[PDB]
Amino acid sequence: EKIPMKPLHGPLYGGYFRTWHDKTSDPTEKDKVNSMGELPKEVDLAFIFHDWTKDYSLFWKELATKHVPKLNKQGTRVIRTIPWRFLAGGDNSGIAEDTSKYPNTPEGNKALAKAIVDEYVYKYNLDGLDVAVLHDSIPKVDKKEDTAGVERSIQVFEEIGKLIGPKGVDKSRLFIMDSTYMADKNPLIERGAPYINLLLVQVYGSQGEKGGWEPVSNRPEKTMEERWQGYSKYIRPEQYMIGFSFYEENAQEGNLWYDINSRKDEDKANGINTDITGTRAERYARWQPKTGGVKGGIFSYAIDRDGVAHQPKKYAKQKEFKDATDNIFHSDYSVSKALKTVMLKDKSYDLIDEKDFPDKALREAVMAQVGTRKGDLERFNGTLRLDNPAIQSLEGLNKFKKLAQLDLIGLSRITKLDRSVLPANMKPGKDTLETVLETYKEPATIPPVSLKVSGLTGLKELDLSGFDRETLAGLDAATLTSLEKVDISGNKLDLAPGTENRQIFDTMLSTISNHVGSNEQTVKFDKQKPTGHYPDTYGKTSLRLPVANEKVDLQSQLLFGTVTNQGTLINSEADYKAYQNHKIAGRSFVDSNYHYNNFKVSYENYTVKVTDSTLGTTTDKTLATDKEETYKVDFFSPADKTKAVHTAKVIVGDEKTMMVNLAEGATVIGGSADPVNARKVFDGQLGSETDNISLGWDSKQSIIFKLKEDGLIKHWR
Amino acid sequence: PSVFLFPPKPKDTLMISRTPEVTCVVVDVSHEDPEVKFNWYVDGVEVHNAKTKPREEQYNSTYRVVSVLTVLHQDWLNGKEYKCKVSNKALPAPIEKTISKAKGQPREPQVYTLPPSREEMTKNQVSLTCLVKGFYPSDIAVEWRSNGQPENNYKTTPPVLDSDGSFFLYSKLTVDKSRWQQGNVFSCSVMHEALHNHYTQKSLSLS
Amino acid sequence: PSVFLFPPKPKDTLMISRTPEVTCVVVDVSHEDPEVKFNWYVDGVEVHNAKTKPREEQYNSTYRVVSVLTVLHQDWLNGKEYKCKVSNKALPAPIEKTISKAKGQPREPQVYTLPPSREEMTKNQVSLTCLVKGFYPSDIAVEWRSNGQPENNYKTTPPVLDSDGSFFLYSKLTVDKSRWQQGNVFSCSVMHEALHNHYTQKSLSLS
């Protein structure tokens, strides 16, 4: 019966064995000399990819009796691969064809879930189920995509997950899903994320490795990284598994990936290439995500074609070509075993030990939240909660290279805090990891870790020097009772009166004076370099000038301001010189090097639109004031040209009331011009670069129209 | 890499409310170097108002980079040479393709509506015909409409080359016999560059 | 080298007196090695009764080796797969092309003759129409004849796909108004596999 087997551990290697290449699949076909029992111990998962093989083939007897126990003995699980449409569909849906037996109801899908599992998993005493969510296997009705069928499969997938998998009664059997779709595109990932053990993305060829191309962007899309990136939200990284493909015999265009090494045109006789060097599979074996954690492993397709060389690219055009590779060979599964050992050689799959985290409560908290690998520390970019109070030493937090957030909650026993016992990304930095995939022809920026320190009663020292911290948010100073030393020098902190940082600093400083006084040795907070941002809104919304023969720079006059991350508006250089002289303990915090010019944000590249009283637009900062006029000056960011950041009201001389276009919204009621394009001369906008506002065909065209409102017309344009 | 420049729809070029497009498809694009830079000219006047269409969901095999260009009606009808210069890194030098309107003396389409056959009156449905002959060039569009409301169930034959040199075509409007016998109006709406406002109608009803 | 297998003329396959041909053109043939060996199969049954056509005038540049095969009518109408296996020395392995009759339930062509339009009666010439609809497959042939004598000046539109799934087409016979008003007979002679003797006529005259 169900043989006991050790759980899934380390890097895995999958392999879809094609049934019709088995020797017992069809005795008439004598060329098939392979067997599914010959799969070695290196192969963790052995998927049963069934087609062509007959319904009542001799393979099914050989599978359940001879193969499954042999594989389970050595340590290899057997999994059945059903398509998407077996869960819900009509066209070739196997079990779901009989809709009268298994209806589309709450109870009906629960009966179908059992029927699927029993027929596929438990029938031959297999060790898991696999669902292939592809466009090739998508639920169709009369060779047309079915909307209700896809919505049914989702619900069925949940019910099957209640039977087998992690959240099932029978957890011995695996529940797997394989997908060419991406996370955002595939709809089952959201619903059946907890219900699966492994996800098997199929990314054959350079289209998978390098990613497709976006012509409008002229940049790569759906890359290997971007593929995972979406799935990272839904599943853990150790569940993820990538797929390559071996050469299928007499393969045609649209199914030639050239993953494993091709045949040499010289070597006409030889059609075997067990060498794995310079292959896509070998690179896939070595590939690890840049964030989140290490992958679960890789898998092959048509593992029965292990070691078989790929048909050259030259002969890819000619359909009827009998190459040496198109012959069938008795594979000894050298590549599978080689690629497995390559993944074992990977050092990231080394477990976390006392070397990394001496403290047990920390080491257990990390294992629960983050992961159980050394590589996970280099990658993981999520929250890490250290709420457990019984924690002595935070040694080896520097192992975390890309941690997103760190919560220190109720950790009284902690005393000192410095770069040693904190993440590496306390300060900013670029990506240190290196990819092992091919590409076309810049390392990613690592966000500084968010630090919430609250409830640490027995915390004494606190060093955050040279970390370039933007704020002091998170530091609950009221709970830090036993505080004595502090160091926040060489950061980008706005420590001005009234700021949240100063409130935290003052609450901290009052604790320092009590215990060991306040001085240069205990307290440090010098040489700050606060980040200068753009303000949300602006105050200077008007400007009355004379009718002088002079020119004025509207930008400098109207558009100015450099807010901080806390919220201190520095408008002029004088305001900064005042800011520089925020003396705390008889010395300023701001660096002397960090002048106003280094802090100031540039308002170059900002566009401007000067609408005069007769709605006459002009895009020039240098406004002449020689003529009497009233203006509405709108400013726009280099990013967003449509939405104005600020609007002003310049009035050279006596104010004139701003006119309004009475034609805008005019009811066209005649003229030779086309009524459609006639309305678009009163639309309000000019039009898109590639619009069409041709009034008519003839050179002369007329428009008869009525105004929207009554008024006194003083001007037209 | 192969280039395939295509002309605008006749209906689009003969109606100013609609927007005509000169599509430039590129098939068998290099998988290694998939960068494609399109350059668009109109009698030498290079325009930069094109729009590369998003990569459609072809399964595998060959990249197919489309590039559309919105064009002025007058420019097409005047017969300006729209040139699509494709530029690929794999390609040693750019592939150019040029297209223009059919060059020849335009001719007015004589539009004629024919009623259902005397034999077809026995059937529960009937076929209203619209002959359109003696026109040039082949760029033409035809539409039916019953009592103002645009018709659904009709089909138009391709422009066929006539003996004299002009083209011709028919358009079959399949309707129920009820609406014919009751006495509705059905109007064949031909559209050709050699018409008043590129438009003309011929009504058809029972007698 | 590119191969282009072509079906027989509809008129040839629907008349036993005429002889149908399955042409297999080969273009862009190697200038270096111009030897082309055609192999002809009919559901595997290799036939050896083909005839390589002489090199037509041609305007240099690229060799175009045509190969004709005379076929039995019944074999075509039954829908046997005619396969043209081209073999060139430059070509690494032979290019095969296969063709057969359209697979689906045949349907009878409803033939209807329509007289000239009421408006066209003002013109010195008139257009006699012949609607042919509701037929499948597209393999069809149409001819006019006035008082027995085969007509010269007429044109037939390609088979156009109808809404239901069948095809249809029109045929325009341009004649003088004199012969129409005088009261001659003109007969639209449709020919389709789903007819009696693959043949049917509909006469047309003044009333």
Ligand SMILES: *[C@@H]1O[C@H](CO[C@@H]2O[C@@H](C)[C@@H](O)[C@@H](O)[C@@H]2O)[C@@H](O[C@@H]2O[C@H](CO)[C@@H](O[C@@H]3O[C@H](CO[C@H]4O[C@H](CO)[C@@H](O)[C@H](O)[C@@H]4O[C@@H]4O[C@H](CO)[C@@H](O)[C@H](O)[C@H]4NC(C)=O)[C@@H](O)[C@H](O[C@H]4O[C@H](CO)[C@@H](O)[C@H](O)[C@@H]4O[C@@H]4O[C@H](CO)[C@@H](O)[C@H](O)[C@H]4NC(C)=O)[C@@H]3O)[C@H](O)[C@H]2NC(C)=O)[C@H](O)[C@H]1NC(C)=O
């Ligand atoms: C585009 O590429 C993708 C793959 O790439 C992926 O997507 C792209 C976009 C990128 O993102 C990549 O990075 C990414 O990796 C293609 O998807 C693959 O397509 C190939 C075929 O081109 C498939 O291989 C074939 O698989 C069929 C199996 O078909 C079953 O399984 C399908 C998947 O579940 C399912 O959709 C089918 O409906 C079918 O399902 C079965 O249905 C029956 C009946 O209901 C049921 O009983 C079964 O239980 C059920 N089984 C399953 C598992 O669902 C297989 O049959 C094919 O074998 C033929 O072709 C081989 C060569 O490719 C050849 O070696 C074999 O010998 C065999 O050839 C036939 O042999 C018989 C004799 O036995 C002979 O009589 C025939 O004449 C002969 N036929 C031919 C044509 O030679 C083959 O193995 C992949 O499985 C599939 N990928 C995956 C992961 O499944 C996509 O199709 C490509 N599209 C285009 C347009 O190019």
